[PDB]
Design a protein around this ligand. Structure first.
Ligand SMILES: OC[C@H]1O[C@H](O[C@H]2[C@H](O)[C@@H](O)[C@@H](O)O[C@@H]2CO)[C@H](O)[C@@H](O)[C@@H]1O
Length: 371
């Protein structure tokens, strides 16, 4: 806990917390209410843990997909924007934070993975996954790799997994069927096999994680990596001429990255929910508030506020980003998403390392998720 009259906010490390802080200062300079910004590891896991006991931030930040389970655990306060306000933000982003019809978070920006490449190494990047092995053989013959991305977080290989068919939960009767899962279908099985084949054929290291991959690329070592706008910041700091473009197709099918929407939720244990309502609505969610943050680290192609969106809807990167988002699908926000992720994370890791075959991996995942 804390005490009404104050206000803490939590948000992930790859996000521009400093800019978020810069938004807090303006708030603390207008009403005295101090604004602290924290960013602890394994946030998606930590929040519910500490928020279970009744502790944590007044405002939590994270991709909408986790808000469903959080609201199922009575950890979130519903929010009540006026029909007019709802016009200030796109409806589909409101949908993203809508659980059981109710609204339990504020959408900020749409996120989606994109293909990022070294232009001095690839003036013309591969339009297909299938041409990466060769592409890596030419590059290897020069002490360089063709691609590297976080193989330890399922969110990153998922684009390839869904491309030819894989999916999380099927939507039906205006609702996600928690029993119909496409984690073990032909499509999913082929995407992952291509991943595992890349590794076994030594064009990728099953070991590669986030820190590792961000380095290989920023340091000119790898020709391509897969990531979201938030990562653009560090790549800007290095001397690397990069392009942000559409993900490579798999079997001619576009890659379908799972789309997220950065969201701000107000803890259920809210002694000052009304302070959060005015903060997020009249500060962070204004052209000035969003700008304050974006300059720190890119929020992504599209932001919830229509007014601010019109201003940056024209930028190769944003472009690439909004293109990968359409070829993809918005993540569900139901409680079972956590089970889904845990399962896919293990299946991918297991498959990549070889502890299980692709078939054993995905089947087991399919079993554990619908279990
Ligand atoms: O790896 C599964 C993981 O995917 C997503 O997490 C993303 C997040 O959406 C982004 O904002 C950024 O932080 O990268 C994360 C990947 O490490 C889901 O939102 C998350 O629930 C899930 O566990």
């Amino acid at each position: 806990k804390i005490e009404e009259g104050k206000l803490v906010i939590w948000i992930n490390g790859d996000k521009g917390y400093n800019g978020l802080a810069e938004v807090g200062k303006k708030f603390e300079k207008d009403t005295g209410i101090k604004v602290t910004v924290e960013h602890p590891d394994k946030l998606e896991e930590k929040f519910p843990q500490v928020a279970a006991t009744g502790d944590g931030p007044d405002i939590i930040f994270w991709a909408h997909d986790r808000f469903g389970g959080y609201a199922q655990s009575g950890l979130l306060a519903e929010i009540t924007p006026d029909k007019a306000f709802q016009d200030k933000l796109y409806p589909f982003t409101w949908d993203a934070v809508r659980y059981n019809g109710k609204l339990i978070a504020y959408p900020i920006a749409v996120e989606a993975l994109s293909l990022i490449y070294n232009k001095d190494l690839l003036p013309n990047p591969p339009k297909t996954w299938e041409e990466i092995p060769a592409l890596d053989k030419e590059l290897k013959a020069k002490g360089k790799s063709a691609l590297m991305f976080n193989l330890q977080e399922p969110y990153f290989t998922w684009p390839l997994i869904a491309a030819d068919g894989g999916y999380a939960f099927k939507y039906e009767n205006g609702k996600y069927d928690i029993k119909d899962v496409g984690v073990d279908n032909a499509g999913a099985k082929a995407g992952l096999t291509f991943l595992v084949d890349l590794i076994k054929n030594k064009h990728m290291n099953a070991c590669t994680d986030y820190s590792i991959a961000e380095a290989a690329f920023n340091k000119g070592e790898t020709a391509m990596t897969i990531n979201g706008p938030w990562a653009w910041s560090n790549i800007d700091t290095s001397k690397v001429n990069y392009g942000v473009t559409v993900l490579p197709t798999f079997k001619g099918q576009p890659s379908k990255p799972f789309v997220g929407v950065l969201s701000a939720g107000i803890n259920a244990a809210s002694p000052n929910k009304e302070l959060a309502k005015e903060f997020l609505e009249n500060y962070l969610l204004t052209d000035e508030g969003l700008e304050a943050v974006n300059k720190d680290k890119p929020l992504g192609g599209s932001v919830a506020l229509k007014s601010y969106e019109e201003e940056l809807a024209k930028d190769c990167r944003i472009a690439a980003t909004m293109e990968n988002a359409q070829k993809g699908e918005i993540m569900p926000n139901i409680p079972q998403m956590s089970a889904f992720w845990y399962a896919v994370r293990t299946a991918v890791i297991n498959a990549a390392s070889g502890r299980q075959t692709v078939d054993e991996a995905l089947k087991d995942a399919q079993t554990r998720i619908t279990k």
